[PDB]
Amino acid sequence: PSNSENNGGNNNLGTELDYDTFCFYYDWYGSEAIDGQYRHWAHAIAPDPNGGSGQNPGTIPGTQESIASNFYPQLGRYSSSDPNILTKHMDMFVMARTGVLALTWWNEQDETEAKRIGLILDAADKKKIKVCFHLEPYPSRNVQNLRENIVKLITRYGNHPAFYRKDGKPLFFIYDSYLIEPSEWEKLLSPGGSITIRNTAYDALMIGLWTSSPTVQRPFILNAHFDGFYTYFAATGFTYGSTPTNWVSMQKWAKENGKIFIPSVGPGYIDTRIRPWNGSVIRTRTDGQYYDAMYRKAIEAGVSAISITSFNEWHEGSQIEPAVPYTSSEFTYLDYENREPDYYLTRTAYWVGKFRESKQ
């Protein structure tokens, strides 16, 4: 039958979703019609951190001609609140074989965000996609309000059929987890911690961000009691963790220490519309060869799970979401070159298959 890729049957077609593949997803885009503003398509231009005083770097206005990306979405200046966009995104996840949507989460305590989360869970479930949360560095984030928010999310969403579980446990990615000391993390994540989630209804796999050298990160991960670690950055060499020649040794350490390594792979990086001074971090896509090289390194490292940066971080040029050629009176956007708009979706499906072929 139609749309039976993920029906719960015995298919061996090489088209199934992979539930150890986590794709970072952003629900912060708006349209004037649905959200009141072209949210995130309009974006502040960041000042140069080395550029000194008197910078009025200005804004990108989020007009049709001028959006806060070096690329241009096939779906245009879409609203993340539009259920018809969300359906299309879930079909794209099915095409890419990415079984887990890792949703940015900013503690907005806003009804419009609660609506989005529920729409995303419902749309994902229709396609047998799962959702987990990517806990961002919201103001005054600390282990106590993280616990309260983990309790809220598991209580609100834990019965939803799309809520992700691995061996019965939810999973969270914690962005910039280094902004919190190991001694604070211990309270939440050690079985002995004063506010532990271990052995509670709110227990979860907690995946911290490995940034710098092993001498710093190994004791950080152990002393913080994270269950595993990810690397996030799509730009190779931005950090030690995002340098793929380190992934074999990072995996060896993870396996020795009972930790889950979820390296992050991406198809390229460019953020110079919003960060004009950040050109050193550009990584060119070269018609897919960059994505291929990074995905191959992750698979060769022997990991059990892979994360993809990103579905739709359009500001950072890491998206696998379809992009189209566009030249406006105001900017000539980058595009997928000699590849079709859906190439990064179907190339993701290819790599998911190689990952599964190798997988434990």
XYZ file of C-alpha atoms in Angstrom:
360
model
C 0.000 0.000 0.000
C 0.918 3.743 -0.432
C 2.971 5.480 2.361
C 3.742 2.115 4.074
C 7.547 2.857 4.530
C 7.061 2.766 8.312
C 3.885 0.625 8.785
C 5.355 -1.667 11.590
C 5.685 -4.594 9.186
C 8.630 -6.757 8.063
C 9.744 -4.589 5.090
C 13.414 -4.713 4.089
C 13.260 -2.108 1.304
C 16.060 0.182 2.448
C 13.544 3.073 2.746
C 12.636 2.753 6.522
C 13.240 5.549 9.037
C 16.322 5.191 11.245
C 15.600 5.906 14.917
C 19.273 6.406 15.800
C 19.496 9.383 13.404
C 18.684 12.765 14.975
C 18.121 15.810 12.769
C 18.294 19.247 14.408
C 15.103 21.171 13.678
C 14.198 24.812 14.249
C 10.601 26.024 14.680
C 11.410 29.744 15.015
C 10.367 30.891 11.502
C 7.302 33.101 11.072
C 5.166 34.742 8.500
C 3.394 38.079 8.939
C 0.028 36.333 8.198
C 0.312 33.522 10.762
C 2.775 34.855 13.373
C 2.560 38.637 12.980
C 6.114 39.069 11.665
C 8.509 37.223 9.306
C 10.255 35.925 12.433
C 13.868 34.755 11.937
C 13.712 35.476 8.153
C 14.223 38.963 9.663
C 17.263 38.877 11.989
C 19.760 41.188 13.611
C 23.254 41.321 12.095
C 25.714 40.346 14.877
C 28.463 42.851 15.697
C 32.079 41.788 15.120
C 33.328 40.499 18.535
C 36.842 41.797 17.538
C 35.499 44.982 15.740
C 35.362 47.430 18.726
C 33.013 50.387 19.428
C 30.439 52.307 17.312
C 29.084 49.273 15.349
C 25.432 49.717 14.314
C 25.622 46.457 12.285
C 21.883 46.753 11.459
C 19.294 44.094 10.546
C 18.180 41.874 7.723
C 14.567 42.807 7.151
C 13.098 39.435 6.118
C 11.577 40.743 2.928
C 11.149 38.414 -0.061
C 14.391 39.843 -1.477
C 16.445 39.920 1.782
C 16.244 37.037 4.285
C 18.647 36.005 7.061
C 20.316 33.182 5.135
C 22.932 32.807 2.427
C 20.541 30.236 0.838
C 16.871 30.484 -0.077
C 14.176 27.960 0.998
C 12.187 26.049 -1.623
C 9.203 26.623 0.689
C 9.877 30.406 0.818
C 9.500 32.543 3.966
C 7.435 29.870 5.696
C 5.790 29.834 9.084
C 6.824 27.089 11.505
C 3.220 27.413 12.805
C 1.666 26.469 9.401
C 0.378 22.891 9.664
C 0.743 22.530 5.862
C 4.496 23.412 6.113
C 4.860 20.926 8.932
C 3.306 18.164 6.797
C 5.777 18.927 4.013
C 8.689 18.885 6.487
C 7.615 15.461 7.794
C 7.504 14.140 4.206
C 11.069 15.494 3.815
C 12.143 13.599 6.968
C 10.623 10.436 5.454
C 12.603 11.055 2.245
C 15.811 11.567 4.280
C 15.112 8.475 6.491
C 15.781 10.609 9.578
C 13.590 9.075 12.267
C 14.150 11.622 15.055
C 13.422 15.364 14.903
C 15.535 17.101 17.564
C 13.518 20.244 18.295
C 15.141 23.481 19.467
C 13.727 24.413 22.873
C 14.176 27.869 24.422
C 11.828 27.948 27.466
C 9.772 30.682 25.789
C 6.706 30.160 28.120
C 4.630 31.363 25.178
C 1.313 29.998 23.942
C 2.449 30.242 20.301
C 5.384 27.905 21.010
C 3.165 25.445 22.915
C 0.952 25.386 19.811
C 3.955 24.698 17.545
C 5.257 21.848 19.727
C 1.875 20.127 19.661
C 1.504 20.613 15.881
C 5.009 19.200 15.337
C 4.343 16.119 17.509
C 1.055 15.472 15.701
C 2.529 15.907 12.209
C 5.559 13.752 13.081
C 3.358 10.958 14.394
C 1.397 10.778 11.111
C 4.690 9.743 9.434
C 6.064 7.654 12.376
C 8.746 10.261 13.079
C 9.800 10.748 16.688
C 10.579 14.041 18.494
C 13.124 14.793 21.165
C 14.151 18.171 22.591
C 17.357 20.174 22.070
C 17.653 22.188 25.271
C 19.096 25.578 24.373
C 20.969 28.116 26.567
C 17.911 30.046 27.729
C 18.310 32.904 30.279
C 19.457 31.769 33.741
C 19.407 28.131 32.629
C 20.613 26.064 35.582
C 20.131 22.503 36.806
C 17.059 23.352 38.926
C 15.054 24.989 36.145
C 16.354 22.307 33.729
C 14.858 19.689 36.039
C 11.600 21.606 36.250
C 11.480 21.891 32.457
C 12.349 18.212 31.911
C 9.524 17.313 34.315
C 7.164 19.651 32.380
C 8.115 18.235 28.982
C 7.879 14.575 30.061
C 4.583 15.263 31.883
C 3.046 17.244 28.952
C 4.387 15.150 26.055
C 5.574 11.790 27.438
C 2.288 10.036 26.478
C 2.343 11.451 22.933
C 3.016 8.589 20.473
C 5.751 10.666 18.730
C 7.715 11.312 21.969
C 11.118 9.669 21.440
C 12.366 6.917 23.760
C 15.505 4.777 23.558
C 15.163 1.542 25.613
C 12.262 3.222 27.464
C 14.051 6.538 28.280
C 13.530 9.957 26.750
C 16.644 11.672 25.324
C 17.707 15.348 25.485
C 20.540 17.133 23.724
C 21.998 19.945 25.872
C 23.505 22.751 23.823
C 26.491 24.639 25.372
C 26.365 22.293 28.393
C 29.837 23.739 29.338
C 28.019 26.916 30.527
C 27.129 24.787 33.630
C 29.780 23.415 35.979
C 30.107 19.638 36.530
C 29.401 20.150 40.239
C 25.929 21.513 39.304
C 25.312 18.795 36.670
C 26.170 16.125 39.342
C 23.147 17.252 41.391
C 20.828 16.440 38.467
C 22.610 13.549 36.747
C 24.462 11.514 39.390
C 22.259 8.789 40.940
C 23.283 10.393 44.283
C 22.576 13.954 43.271
C 20.397 16.199 45.471
C 17.894 16.730 42.624
C 18.641 13.594 40.633
C 16.478 12.431 37.757
C 18.047 8.964 37.976
C 15.604 6.250 39.065
C 12.687 8.687 38.766
C 9.813 9.072 36.309
C 11.886 11.853 34.720
C 15.051 9.856 33.996
C 16.447 10.517 30.490
C 19.543 10.045 28.343
C 21.336 13.397 28.664
C 23.664 14.163 25.756
C 26.092 16.998 26.435
C 28.080 19.076 23.954
C 31.696 17.926 23.607
C 33.630 21.058 22.538
C 37.367 21.166 23.285
C 40.300 18.801 23.977
C 39.972 15.420 25.707
C 41.963 16.686 28.715
C 39.042 19.108 29.461
C 36.071 17.164 28.017
C 36.720 13.652 29.410
C 36.598 14.666 33.095
C 33.755 17.155 32.335
C 31.560 14.360 30.846
C 32.391 11.906 33.634
C 32.040 14.381 36.531
C 28.809 15.870 35.083
C 27.315 12.339 34.686
C 26.123 12.855 31.105
C 24.972 9.689 29.370
C 26.696 10.705 26.153
C 27.869 13.581 24.012
C 27.391 15.206 20.620
C 29.455 17.789 18.716
C 26.829 19.954 16.886
C 28.980 22.170 14.682
C 28.619 21.523 10.967
C 31.923 23.320 10.179
C 34.828 20.863 10.351
C 37.608 22.075 12.640
C 35.538 24.713 14.461
C 36.187 22.754 17.664
C 38.162 19.641 18.565
C 34.812 17.845 18.743
C 33.815 18.964 15.248
C 37.142 17.757 13.739
C 36.173 14.377 12.288
C 39.684 12.859 12.446
C 39.122 12.843 16.274
C 35.946 10.733 16.066
C 37.594 7.274 16.155
C 39.357 8.151 19.438
C 36.266 9.899 20.839
C 34.224 6.749 20.133
C 36.912 4.548 21.756
C 36.722 6.663 24.927
C 32.901 6.656 24.865
C 32.767 2.843 24.611
C 35.389 2.446 27.404
C 33.379 4.775 29.708
C 29.794 3.570 28.919
C 28.893 6.837 27.111
C 26.885 7.315 23.918
C 28.714 9.303 21.218
C 26.409 10.979 18.681
C 28.716 12.841 16.311
C 27.124 15.675 14.346
C 27.475 15.811 10.563
C 26.423 18.545 8.191
C 26.478 19.468 4.535
C 28.334 22.791 4.804
C 28.389 26.019 6.796
C 27.985 29.712 6.005
C 26.498 32.391 8.238
C 27.884 35.607 6.747
C 24.497 37.305 6.094
C 24.017 37.467 9.896
C 27.735 37.328 10.882
C 29.618 39.185 8.101
C 32.923 38.936 10.023
C 32.696 35.099 10.320
C 33.920 34.115 6.848
C 36.736 31.895 8.269
C 34.043 29.372 9.328
C 32.650 28.965 5.766
C 32.697 25.372 4.557
C 31.720 24.968 0.906
C 29.292 22.204 -0.073
C 31.153 21.200 -3.306
C 28.078 19.488 -4.843
C 27.672 17.198 -1.817
C 31.270 16.065 -1.362
C 31.632 17.901 1.976
C 28.530 16.166 3.376
C 29.760 12.809 2.035
C 33.159 13.177 3.657
C 31.758 14.117 7.060
C 29.048 11.406 7.070
C 31.629 8.784 6.037
C 33.867 9.782 9.006
C 30.969 9.386 11.437
C 30.105 5.920 10.109
C 33.797 4.862 10.010
C 34.148 5.876 13.691
C 31.816 2.980 14.560
C 29.150 4.993 16.397
C 25.653 3.773 17.273
C 23.855 7.089 16.574
C 24.424 10.127 14.347
C 23.077 13.673 14.559
C 22.589 15.961 11.543
C 23.268 19.683 11.705
C 20.788 20.621 10.398
C 17.318 20.249 8.928
C 16.730 23.996 8.778
C 19.292 26.218 10.559
C 19.041 28.557 7.555
C 21.048 31.308 9.235
C 24.071 29.019 9.404
C 23.817 27.442 5.965
C 23.863 23.921 7.423
C 20.367 22.954 6.261
C 19.480 19.816 4.320
C 15.979 21.239 3.696
C 15.483 21.972 -0.026
C 16.884 25.287 -1.299
C 16.335 26.916 -4.696
C 18.256 29.345 -6.863
C 17.222 32.914 -6.242
C 18.649 36.267 -7.248
C 16.836 39.279 -5.921
C 17.497 42.973 -6.530
C 19.218 42.875 -3.032
C 21.247 39.558 -2.857
C 22.376 36.646 -5.015
C 21.747 33.570 -2.859
C 23.818 30.418 -2.879
C 21.990 27.272 -4.044
C 22.630 23.548 -4.474
C 24.746 24.110 -7.605
C 24.675 21.057 -9.895
C 22.306 19.240 -7.461
C 18.505 19.391 -7.356
C 16.767 21.056 -4.375
C 16.043 17.683 -2.650
C 19.576 16.314 -3.159
C 20.585 16.666 0.501
C 17.432 14.794 1.570
C 18.076 11.887 -0.778
C 21.813 11.923 0.020
C 20.933 11.716 3.706
C 18.821 8.620 2.915
C 21.887 7.111 1.180
C 24.094 7.712 4.215
C 21.430 6.415 6.621
C 21.564 3.194 4.605
C 25.373 2.999 4.862
C 25.068 3.723 8.599
C 22.535 0.896 9.032
C 24.643 -1.448 6.953
C 27.529 -0.841 9.393
C 25.413 -0.437 12.530
C 25.599 -2.414 15.793
